[PDB]
Design a protein around this ligand. Sequence first.
Ligand SMILES: CCCCCCCCCC(=O)OC[C@H](COP(=O)([O-])OCCN)OC(=O)CCCCCCCCC
Ligand SMILES: CCCCCCCCCC(=O)OC[C@H](COP(=O)([O-])OCCN)OC(=O)CCCCCCCCC
Ligand SMILES: CCCN(CCC)S(=O)(=O)c1ccc(C(=O)O)cc1
Ligand SMILES: NCCOB(c1ccccc1)c1ccccc1
Lengths: 95, 594, 78, 77
Amino acid sequence: LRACGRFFQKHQGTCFYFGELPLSLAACTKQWDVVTYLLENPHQPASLEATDSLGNTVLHALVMIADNSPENSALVIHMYDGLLQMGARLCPTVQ
Amino acid sequence: FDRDRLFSVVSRGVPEELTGLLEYLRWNSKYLTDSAYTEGSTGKTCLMKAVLNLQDGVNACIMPLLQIDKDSGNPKLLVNAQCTDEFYQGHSALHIAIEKRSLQCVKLLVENGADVHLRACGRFFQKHQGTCFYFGELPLSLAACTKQWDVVTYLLENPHQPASLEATDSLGNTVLHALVMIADNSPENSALVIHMYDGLLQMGARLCPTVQLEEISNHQGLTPLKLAAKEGKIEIFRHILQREFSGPYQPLSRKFTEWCYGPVRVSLYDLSSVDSWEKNSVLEIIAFHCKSPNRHRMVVLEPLNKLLQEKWDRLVSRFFFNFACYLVYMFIFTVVAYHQPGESMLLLGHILILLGGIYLLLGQLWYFWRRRLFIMDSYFEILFLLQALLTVLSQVLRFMETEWYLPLLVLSLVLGWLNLLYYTRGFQHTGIYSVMIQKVILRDLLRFLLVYLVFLFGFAVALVSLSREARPYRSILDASLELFKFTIGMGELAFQEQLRFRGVVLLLLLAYVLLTYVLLLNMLIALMSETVNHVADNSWSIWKLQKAISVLEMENGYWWCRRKKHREGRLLKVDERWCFRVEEVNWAAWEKTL
Amino acid sequence: PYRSILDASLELFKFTIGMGELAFQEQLRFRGVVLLLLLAYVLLTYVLLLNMLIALMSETVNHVADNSWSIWKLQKAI
Amino acid sequence: LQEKWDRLVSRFFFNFACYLVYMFIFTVVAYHQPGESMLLLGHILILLGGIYLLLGQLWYFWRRRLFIMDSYFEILF
Ligand SMILES: CCCCCCCCCC(=O)OC[C@H](COP(=O)([O-])OCCN)OC(=O)CCCCCCCCC
Ligand SMILES: CCCCCCCCCC(=O)OC[C@H](COP(=O)([O-])OCCN)OC(=O)CCCCCCCCC
Ligand SMILES: CCCN(CCC)S(=O)(=O)c1ccc(C(=O)O)cc1
Ligand SMILES: NCCOB(c1ccccc1)c1ccccc1
């Protein structure tokens, strides 16, 4: 599901950009237990190659929400590596 | 049994020696409240001595002392007796008990009939610049300024005589007002005052639910929220604006969170006594009635930051229309000044600057009449008045055909162009840049001028007197002018052979040079010392204060047309209040919450 | 003196370069007032120089010398 | 020291006022140096005033002879 309202779009104002997918939302918020289950559940697994209205994937969304603060950047990097490493299991043929 | 023996035994705390006191009082038909047993210096009674002389927390002499007075048939009460000195008027034994931090004595006095509403209104307790201790004037207010929870609850809910949070002192200050005044901006002090503020306010919902403690106004007409704005105490001022509670004490909140979604929070802020629609509001107090240096930091808080921003956006068109009308008026002024001796347009131009001068004159007179109660923030308001007065005077002089009309017209043109800095505050580009001129730049320029001009006169008189004998400087005005040319880098320092004392005159001119250089370096050093100890963030807050003052003036409209004030926010049930929705996004705080 | 804006602008600018001719010109009827305007221009201009000097001064204290090496590398990178 | 200053603050300004009067006479006489009677009276006052400051400062330095920039104005006076 793609939440593409003006509140979720990135702009100068009252907004919360996290990408537009539940997988991207579960990645911007430091929620490991949610993000793995969404990716490897047997009912309907999410795909890291999914893109929002701007074409941003999960890795692109993490970059945009990443500040230069060293508390924020540590979690974004750790989330970045974990999603990238787990992507080698679910979709090895996709870079 | 005289005063000296009685004062000694109560100090030593030996009830066994107090046996003969009752017999002596009955024999002489006297009471403990009589002037014979009170120190004439202040009016201290025998009970007051006992409370300040404590052992193990309870003075065993107090109880026998109190029951003796009851047996003595005193028409007054020793417990309710107060001092009579000018400095310590109204001081009582109950005040001493709370000060000594001894709940047991406070329990003892009220059980025997202590009046909890005794008002210590002496000069020592009144707030003034000097040796004083302002805590309000009631024992309840004293028990609140001192962090004594156990005392303050018992005084409020005791079955003998319960105190009331709605009680007021000589200035009309309640318990909440007293906490505000004694509240410093230190973050150890402000934490206890806020915690005391919430606790008394919450407990007030139990003892007096029908009474709104936050809306009680003192003799100055200020609520506890308005008093914090006037006193410039931002730390407690911020908490009241953003006060939020949950559970049974939810109605006591002023900030109601509507919905929170990640870093984005939506909160309904109460605008009661805050919106500028009502007279003597918090916004008006900060801009005009407040005089603390913190008033620029209080206009950037929420909801004031968004409340003033929305007012500015509505009135930004009025600000530029006012700016455009001033540019047109000054464009006419400049053209008429230049083309002063085709005559019909000059006459029309003279009329417009005459009508314009009256318009600014009446506008500024109306402003100062409204500002007469509290008057550097009005720096341009004075200049806009002077430009109007000189323009009116110049046009009046032109009617009388006196030649001095032209100098006044030209001085008005100079002042009018300089008044254009007032409209730099309407743009973020120019507003922030022009902040650091009135605060430091303009003040220290005056310091150098006054000192330098005095000794410019001293050297000018010296040069003229010394140069009067021949082997230049014919008067003070001339000698002042030549001496001033050294400052502008055009001073003619030459060995003038026409003077008999040619050598000495050069020495005076040289001595003036380095002595003046001392003044420039001192001024440069003075300018230099505040730049290092300066915060760039203050420039943004000071500019917002300048816009805050501006929007409040335009809300009143023009002097010739008073516009109806529009109330901000909307009436929303939260118990319905005129709340103001504020949308706030904070990634840093949200991530720390995760 | 001061026959036009271009002339009057030039004489007023000479004060900034330290060559301003501040004299009591007897040829003018309002000789006293003209001097007051010239004097008022001097301190008012000095306010502008000091404000600019203060503005220049405030970023030097809050400056990092390491940025100069990185900015130069960006210039070479471009 | 604050209570001593409050008691002697009137003496400080009286000393200041006497110096302003003395310098006002000094400035007038210096300017109007070559009606002659007032100039002669003005010359006498600055002569008597000069001796007064001379004797006052000599007495000060005699008492300060044991321990001598804090006396910067004492030298100038
Ligand atoms: C568009 C053509 C205008 C031609 C010139 C007319 C005279 C204008 C006089 C003038 O300079 O007014 C300035 C004023 C705004 O100043 P302020 O209140 O911001 O001053 C700030 C001080 N700190 O401006 C106003 O208040 C608005 C103008 C009102 C015009 C109608 C007047 C009707 C009178 C009966
Ligand atoms: C009111 C009219 C005065 C007319 C001028 C009279 C001469 C005054 C001379 C003068 O300048 O005295 C200054 C002196 C104070 O200096 P100081 O001790 O603070 O110097 C500070 C140095 N650091 O002042 C005093 O000591 C007080 C004046 C004494 C007047 C009576 C004199 C009687 C003599 C017999
Ligand atoms: C109009 C906003 C609707 N929502 C926000 C999403 C942008 S919401 O998801 O319905 C929501 C969220 C949180 C709370 C709450 O914290 O009380 C209530 C409602
Ligand atoms: N070209 C427009 C420049 O605007 B100014 C400006 C622009 C951005 C930030 C700060 C200021 C400006 C110019 C002169 C004096 C004061 C401010």
